[PDB]
Design a protein around this ligand. Structure first.
Ligand SMILES: CCCCCCCCCCCCCCCCCC(=O)OC[C@H](COP(=O)([O-])OCC(O)COP(=O)([O-])OC[C@@H](COC(=O)CCCCCCCCCCCCCCCCC)OC(=O)CCCCCCCCCCCCCCCCC)OC(=O)CCCCCCCCCCCCCCCCC
Ligand code: SF4
Ligand code: SF4
Ligand code: SF4
Ligand code: SF4
Ligand code: FES
Ligand SMILES: [Mg+2]
Ligand SMILES: [Zn+2]
Lengths: 230, 125, 208, 176, 112, 115, 96, 97
């Protein structure tokens, strides 16, 4: 049967094996996340989803930790806020200043989560990291200095598209996401990496520089290019 | 005492809208789809009523995008589908209602990435 | 100390809460709800037919001498059954305070005119009618105040378009100004500015 | 505290009564007004000899708009549309595309000077100091269309007023 | 005694105490018609008896004004008249009755 | 609510009475409006326009809506009587400078995308 | 470097030029077409390529606070120059 | 300014005040149009440690208004919105004009 957990003291009935992030979503709280995608596997590396359990001295990765009976999840606690601020601080410390020239622009998860969960000032007094851009076809434009090594594109590529030509090379702060060779990521499902990349590292090349998200009007229609009716 | 009106509410004669934009307009009541470029779901909370798209042409001078439809930018926010339907009915516009699409609950397990005998094992991290 | 955070005033908060309890006890027939905002502003939500008694009490009572009608306006919320929300802001000089009284109404339900309590209610209610379509029952002279002569529709409603439906120009054939359907050389560009990430946890609503 | 503007009362003694009677019969305060006007007549006027003498201005002055360049000659604007987003009057229209060398550069940059309120938000929001409100204000036109600027006109304004704009930005950029 | 009250249209009263006693007695007489359990009657009776006690124990007008803390004695008289008229109106209105009608399910919700 | 608060007129009979009273008030005013504003229209044209404006709301079956309509009609009349309006608005009632909008499907198809 | 269309109308730096049969060319009759003669692409081509002995360079456009936001360019791919895209400036490691 | 003494004396007699003490035209007494460069102060929240935004987030301290009374849900003394305003004291600087 369902077990009883608590989110900020509010009782929730969840199935065994449900994660902390899913319990908070069920109660109505969307925990900030970068590497977590519901359609993909659980990676738990960006560490942005760390939350505090009421009696646990250590924060837990909400996207990977299954809930136990009688767990009180403190979503808006001081420890959770400090953890989110620290993770955002590291991300933006190594992130480059490209927002005006970056197509992700006003629809960026890094920007929005920085404005909602991170600090507003920088303590980084050193130089930043620069990463050589790759070329993976005429559809996806890669500016890899903006990558946050969230491994969404790798996981999507392998699991969904059945193509394992993406991965991380090297280790440490020098880890780079790409192909390691001049190979184009050509597949019939290669725009979804543009969609799911939380930052502007992977962007649409035909759409490059043309518009900004706040200007666009969204019309909900269907697809006719095939018989799927997407 | 207090009178009773056993008839549907209709304020079209009082709103002042032209008959063309009363009769030939079909609004769309729906919950907006999540912007696929972001994982945030806070913009998919409230129902929205929006009108149908009309013609836009190019200005002969300066090449701007002209219009002739007053209700082009008119978008209304409603807390409930019933509230939006009642508003549309009392204002007399036609309406198409689309049901809210909520993601189905999914079973996620970190340990499935290292299955001993299942295909769920991942080849990289 | 926190230099960037506005300080709170517990004394004023407690005084306003006590006075809200006082008025709620005095007038149970109309007072539906009482609130005190965290920046020390008292609000009273009453039944729409209690406007005259509540305003007369808050004006003439010795402990509530709200002589001055600071403001009177309406707020349009289409998603509610009673969309229009009539707001009265009152100032008490003797006790150096302010109060707010909020009632509700829809298109076809009149609201009793409060010109017998405050004289500024005359023009304030004329403006409310002109801009929202709310009719006030016993108004000495209820007519449009701000819109053009013969203007159709009430501009401040949420469902009234920003540019309206008609525009004016001088037509030389008829030697007079004419009103023609609106047509913009450059259409107003609608921006979707809301971020999809929740900003304030304290105001989160139950998913329901 | 407070003070009374008109609460005095005149003394009813014979000398004061006679003084008031003399003021009534002999228009003393009217003569005082005449004397003040005569003083102003003999003073020096404050009129400047326009257009040969120009009124004072400051480096922060908001005038005609301009699009600037880097010293290399490359345009500063990167088509980020921050000015278009922040423009209160929606007087800026921008359309961009990748250039022949792949740069993020605008193809259309229009400012409607009959719609702009000259509020200066565009030069505040610009992260590259591309769009500026220059010092020129004598640009009245005989036709409406001449006030609908485009990218060519704004670049011409920048090239025409670059020295003064650069000097003003150097003078006032430490307050920004 | 004093030349003016400092307010335009507010005449000086040469008999403040008698007028105040008369007005407070009239207010108390009107409040007797209101039902005992009504909360308007209790508070108004309390404040009226509190203020009526001060006017009968202080013959000096200035010290009485300082005790009442209601502006000048003319302003106090005007407020007593307003309170009397309000008491009559409240006797007509009968607002001690239970709530006329509860609002709809979501009428004061915000944001919405 | 089942017991809706009436503005006045209670049922539809008194609302019709008010409609007829307002119609008489407008009808007796058209000669004065033509004379004072120096309109170039006929008195018959003004009466026909008043009749048409009354008839475009003939389908209303709600007494409150009818009461609001007659209130706004009295407002419009008092604007005309006091010469608050000009010839501009009185002629705005006539749409004298609009091209005849096509109403057939074929003409609408030819001119543009308008339904 | 301005160029002339076959209809005799100068082309702007965006390639704008009305067609031969376009009626909108009548607006320039008895008047002039506002065209800027300086092309940013040509000028930035005229600018040379810098050579610095480091894998990562930092560009701010010069002037400090008067320039563009500071960015870092990775000079690892020797087949091409690293271009700061705020100002279109090319840097290169010394090969050979 | 630049004027003859006779005209200045005539102005002083007609106006009754020494005009040269307080004129209405500016003669080199105003600050020069060129000024040394400034260096503005940085601010209170520009520290490198013990400065977390969660401890100084003004917006997140805002709270929904407290519901004092809701119909849905001894002898107490009557109260007032606030203590009555104290009488204003007449100005010692210049009580009467
Ligand atoms: C001569 C006038 C200017 C004198 C000063 C001078 O030249 O300064 C250089 C001056 C440079 O300026 P500045 O020195 O830097 O500034 C002045 C200082 O700040 C200093 O400014 P300030 O205001 O202190 O200077 C005033 C000073 C110096 O200024 C004067 O003295 C003003 C001029 C004299 C006033 C009285 C005129 C009487 C009638 C004219 C004939 C006699 C006077 C002229 C000849 C005098 C010979 C000794 O005078 C006084 O201090 C007192 C003078 C006596 C005052 C008496 C009471 C006022 C009423 C007088 C009524 C007169 C009768 C009614 C009029 C009759 C018809 C004209 O440049 C000019 O004057 C250039 C020309 C400007 C226009 C002059 C127009 C008037 C010419 C005479 C009358 C018109 C005749 C021709 C008509 C042609 C028609 C086509
Ligand atoms: S990915 Fe986001 S944070 Fe990074 S440059 Fe682009 S908009 Fe800015
Ligand atoms: S390129 Fe994008 S999706 Fe891939 S790991 Fe980097 S941030 Fe994630
Ligand atoms: S000054 Fe203000 S109104 Fe004018 S273009 Fe700039 S942002 Fe727009
Ligand atoms: S803010 Fe500056 S860089 Fe951005 S689009 Fe406007 S002018 Fe160009
Ligand atoms: S969302 Fe959980 S660690 Fe990334
Ligand atoms: Mg992306
Ligand atoms: Zn640069």
């Amino acid at each position: 049967n369902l077990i009883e957990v608590f989110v900020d003291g509010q009782s929730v009935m969840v199935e065994p094996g449900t994660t902390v992030l899913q319990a908070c979503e069920k109660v109505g709280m969307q925990i900030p996340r970068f590497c977590y995608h519901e359609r993909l596997s659980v990676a738990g590396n960006c560490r942005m989803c760390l939350v505090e359990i009421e009696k646990a001295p250590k924060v837990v990765a909400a996207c990977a930790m299954p809930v136990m009976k009688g767990w009180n999840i403190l979503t808006n606690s001081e420890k959770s806020k400090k953890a989110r601020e620290g993770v955002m601080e590291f991300l933006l410390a190594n992130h480059p200043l490209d927002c005006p020239i970056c197509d992700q622009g006003g629809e960026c998860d890094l920007q929005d989560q920085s404005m909602m969960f991170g600090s507003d000032r920088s303590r980084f007094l050193e130089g930043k990291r620069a990463v050589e851009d790759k070329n993976i076809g005429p559809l996806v434009k890669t500016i890899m200095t903006r990558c946050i090594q969230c491994t969404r594109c790798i996981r999507f590529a392998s699991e969904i598209a059945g193509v394992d030509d993406l991965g991380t090379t090297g280790r440490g702060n020098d880890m780079q996401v790409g192909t390691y060779i001049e190979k184009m990521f050509m597949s019939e499902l290669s725009g979804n990496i543009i969609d799911i990349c939380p930052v502007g590292a992977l962007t649409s090349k035909p759409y490059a520089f043309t518009a900004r998200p706040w200007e666009t009007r969204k019309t909900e229609s269907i697809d006719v290019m095939d018989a799927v009716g997407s | 005492q207090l009178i009773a009106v056993d008839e549907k509410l209709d304020i079209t004669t009082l709103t002042g809208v032209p008959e063309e934009h009363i009769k030939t307009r079909k609004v769309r009541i729906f919950v907006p789809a999540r912007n696929n470029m972001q994982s945030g779901v806070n913009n998919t909370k409230k129902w929205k009523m929006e009108f149908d798209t009309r013609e836009r042409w190019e200005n002969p001078l300066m090449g701007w995008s002209s219009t002739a439809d007053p209700l082009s930018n008119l978008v209304l926010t409603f807390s409930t589908k019933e509230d939006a339907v009642a508003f549309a009915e009392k204002n007399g516009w036609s309406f198409d209602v689309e049901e809210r699409k909520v993601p189905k609950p999914k079973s996620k397990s970190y340990g499935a990435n290292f299955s001993w005998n299942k295909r769920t094992r991942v080849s990289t991290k | 100390t926190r230099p960037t955070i506005r300080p709170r005033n517990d004394v004023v908060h407690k005084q306003l809460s006590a006075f809200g309890q006082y008025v709620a006890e005095i007038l149970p027939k109309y007072v539906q709800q009482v609130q005190v905002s965290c920046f020390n502003e008292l609000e009273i939500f009453i039944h729409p037919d209690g406007v005259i008694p509540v305003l007369t009490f808050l004006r003439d009572h010795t402990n509530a001498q709200f002589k001055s009608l600071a403001d009177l306006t309406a707020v349009d919320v289409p998603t509610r059954q009673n969309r229009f929300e009539i707001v009265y802001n009152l100032l008490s000089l003797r006790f150096n305070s302010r109060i707010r009284v909020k009632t509700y109404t829809d298109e076809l339900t009149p609201i009793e005119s409060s010109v017998t309590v405050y004289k500024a209610a005359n023009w304030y209610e004329r403006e409310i009618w002109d801009m929202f379509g709310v009719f006030f029952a016993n108004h000495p002279d209820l007519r449009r105040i701000l819109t053009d002569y013969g203007f159709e529709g009430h501009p401040f409603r949420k469902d009234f378009p920003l540019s309206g439906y008609v525009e004016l120009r001088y037509d030389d054939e008829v030697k007079r100004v004419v009103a023609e359907p609106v047509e913009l050389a450059q259409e107003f560009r609608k921006f979707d500015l809301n971020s999809p990430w929740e900003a304030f946890p304290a105001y989160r609503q139950p998913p329901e | 505290t407070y003070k009374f503007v008109n609460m005095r009362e005149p003394s009813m003694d014979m000398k004061s009564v006679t003084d008031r009677a003399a003021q009534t019969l002999l228009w003393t305060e009217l003569v005082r007004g005449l004397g003040m006007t005569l003083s102003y007549l003999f003073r020096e006027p404050a009129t400047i000899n326009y257009p040969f003498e120009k009124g004072p201005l400051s480096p922060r002055f908001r005038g005609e708009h301009a699009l600037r360049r880097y010293p290399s000659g490359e345009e500063r604007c990167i088509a980020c549309k921050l000015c278009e987003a922040v423009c209160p009057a929606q007087a800026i229209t921008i359309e961009a595309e990748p250039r022949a060398d792949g740069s993020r550069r605008t193809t259309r940059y229009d400012i409607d000077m009959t719609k702009c309120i000259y509020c200066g938000f565009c030069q505040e929001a610009c992260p590259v100091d591309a769009i500026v409100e220059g010092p020129n204000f004598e640009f009245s036109t005989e036709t409406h269309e001449e006030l609908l600027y485009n990218k060519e006109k704004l670049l011409n304004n920048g090239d025409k007023w670059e020295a003064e704009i650069a000097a003003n930005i150097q003078a006032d950029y430490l307050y920004r | 005694l004093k030349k003016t009250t400092g307010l335009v249209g507010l005449a000086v009263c040469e008999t403040p105490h008698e007028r105040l006693k008369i007005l407070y007695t009239k207010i108390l007489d009107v409040l007797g018609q209101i039902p005992k359990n009504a909360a308007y009657r209790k508070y108004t009776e309390q404040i009226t008896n509190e203020k009526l006690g001060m006017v009968k124990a202080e013959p000096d007008v200035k010290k009485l004004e300082e005790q009442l803390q209601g502006g000048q004695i003319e302003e106090v008289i005007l407020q007593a008249e307003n309170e009397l008229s309000l008491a009559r109106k409240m006797l007509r209105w009968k607002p001690w009755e239970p709530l006329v009608e509860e609002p709809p399910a979501n009428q004061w919700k915000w944001p919405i | 609510g089942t017991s809706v608060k009436p503005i006045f007129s209670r049922d539809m009979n008194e609302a019709k009475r008010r409609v007829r009273e307002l119609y008489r008030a407008w009808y007796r005013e058209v000669p004065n409006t033509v004379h004072l504003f120096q309109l170039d229209i006929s008195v018959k044209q003004g009466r026909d326009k008043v009749r048409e404006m009354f008839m475009k709301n003939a389908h209303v079956t709600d007494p409150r809506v009818v009461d609001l309509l007659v209130i706004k009609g009295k407002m419009e009349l008092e604007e005309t009587i006091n010469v608050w309006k000009q010839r501009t608005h009185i002629m705005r009632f006539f749409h004298e400078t609009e091209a005849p909008r096509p109403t057939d499907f074929l003409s609408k198809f030819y001119v543009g995308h308008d339904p | 470097g301005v160029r002339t269309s076959p209809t005799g109308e100068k082309v702007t730096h965006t390639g704008q030029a009305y067609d031969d049969g376009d009626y909108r060319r009548v607006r320039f009759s008895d008047r002039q077409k506002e065209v800027n003669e300086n092309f940013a692409i040509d000028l930035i081509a005229e600018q040379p390529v810098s050579e610095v002995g480091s894998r990562v360079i930092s560009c701010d456009g010069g002037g400090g606070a008067l320039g563009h936001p500071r960015v870092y360019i990775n000079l690892d791919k020797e087949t091409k120059t690293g271009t700061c895209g705020y100002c279109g400036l090319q840097f290169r490691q010394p090969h050979h | 300014a630049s004027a003859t003494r006779v005209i200045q004396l005539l102005r002083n007699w007609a106006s009754g005040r020494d005009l040269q003490a307080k004129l209405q035209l500016r003669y080199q007494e105003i600050s020069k149009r060129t000024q040394p460069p400034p260096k503005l102060p940085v601010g209170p929240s520009h520290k490198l440690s013990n400065n977390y935004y969660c401890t100084r987030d003004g917006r997140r301290e805002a709270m929904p208004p407290s519901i004092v009374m809701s119909s849905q849900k001894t002898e107490k003394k009557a109260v007032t919105p606030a203590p009555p305003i104290k009488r204003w004291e007449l100005s010692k600087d210049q009580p009467y004009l």
